[PDB]
């Protein structure tokens, strides 16, 4: 659920958070952990190329299975855990082999269920199938774009895509953004919606809470100097004294479309958002 906090202080006044009712265990699977090091937006050369990053709580990588290519082995859900590296939760699945791996937790996935992948899998929440074996109208997630590569298209918490038709070698999908797209029929997908739907209702409440997650402050361009930003300067507060609002590097920023005009995938996009 969503947990409101009592207004004891001025920083806890508007703050809300999840209660983590779905999470089952608090210890990760040791043999599936890899180290991460923060980069703070620093380049290959050490330059700050993407700004407003750096300096949060330290985390550790949990290696996830997006390919889902273990076919014919019944996999049993063991726990549902917390992942700092993504908005959705994850589920630990240990197969009849003895092997264990993490997957994205779908909506309604509970401990004790059995999960299948392949061609003979049933259409149930958690199973992985090729897009040609999925009937029209089902809600899927974790769509992959090239066969054998791994899930990539719908993966954040509460997101879902819907199968929409067939065109021989391709399948129509209505992506979460509202886009209709053509994807090969030999690419896989998982049935269901993605786990943690309430994630968008959280009110951060504090500036320090943004700092905990790795976000440095954002300075507006109107309070800079003329050599710093196309908006800086002027005596007092100044309007946007230009034809259009501008990014820190020129290149208008409001309404100006930035997709390449000679793209090679314009023939696979049926209708844009």
Specify whether the CB–CB gap between 190 and 153 falls below 8 A: no
CA distance 40 to 56: 9
By C-beta, is 53 or 100 nearer to Mg ion?
53
**Least Å distance between CB 82 and RNA?**
14
Q: Which does 27 bind (CB under 5 to 8 A by kind): RNA, Mg ion, none?
A: none
Neighbours of 269 (CB within 10 A): 13
Q: How is residue 63 written in tokens? A: 């290696």
Binder among 27, 64, 106, 123 for RNA (CB under 7 A): 64
CA 97 vs. chain centroid, Å, equals 30
By C-beta, is 1 or 98 nearer to RNA?
1
Helices (DSSP H) in the chain: which residue ranges?
A: 207-212
Site residues (CB under 7 A) for RNA, limited to 102-161: 137, 145, 152-159
Position 208 contacts Mg ion (CB under 5 A): no
Q: Which does 64 bind (CB under 5 to 8 A by kind): RNA, Mg ion, none?
A: RNA
CA distances to 28, 73, 100, 238 from 112, in Å: 18, 16, 15, 62
Position 234 contacts Mg ion (CB under 5 A): yes
CA distance 273 to 175: 9
Position 236 contacts Mg ion (CB under 5 A): yes
**Least Å distance between CB 192 and RNA?**
13
| Known binding-site residue numbers for Mg(2+) | 38, 52, 83, 86, 236, 247
**Contacting residues toward Mg ion, per CB under 5 A:** 52, 218, 220, 230, 233-234, 236, 238, 241
């Amino acid at each position: 659920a969503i947990k409101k906090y009592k207004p004891t202080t001025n920083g806890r006044r508007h703050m809300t958070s999840s209660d983590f009712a779905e999470i089952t265990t608090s210890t990760p699977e040791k043999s599936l952990l890899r180290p991460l090091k923060k980069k703070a937006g620093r380049n290959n050369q050490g330059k700050l190329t993407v700004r407003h990053h750096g300096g949060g709580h330290k985390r550790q990588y949990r290696v996830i299975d997006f390919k889902r290519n273990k076919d014919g082995i019944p996999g049993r859900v063991a726990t549902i855990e917390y992942d700092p590296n993504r908005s959705a939760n994850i589920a630990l699945i240990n197969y009849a082999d003895g092997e264990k791996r993490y997957i994205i937790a779908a909506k309604g996935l509970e401990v004790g269920q059995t999960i299948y992948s392949g061609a003979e899998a049933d259409i149930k929440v958690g199973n992985a199938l090729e897009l040609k074996d999925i009937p029209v109208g089902t809600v899927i997630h974790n769509i992959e774009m090239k066969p054998g590569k791994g899930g990539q298209l719908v993966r954040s918490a509460g997101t879902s895509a819907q199968v929409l038709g067939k065109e021989g070698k391709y399948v129509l999908i209505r992506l979460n953004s509202g886009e209709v797209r053509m994807i090969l029929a030999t690419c896989r997908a998982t049935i269901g919606q993605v786990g943690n739907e309430q994630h968008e209702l959280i009110n951060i409440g504090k500036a320090g809470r943004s700092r905990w997650m790795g976000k440095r402050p954002t300075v507006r361009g109107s309070v800079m100097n003329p050599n710093d930003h196309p908006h800086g300067g002027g005596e007092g507060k100044a309007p946007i004294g230009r034809k259009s609002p501008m990014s820190p590097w020129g290149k208008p920023t409001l309404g100006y479309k930035t997709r390449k005009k000679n793209n090679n995938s314009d023939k696979f996009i049926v209708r844009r958002r």
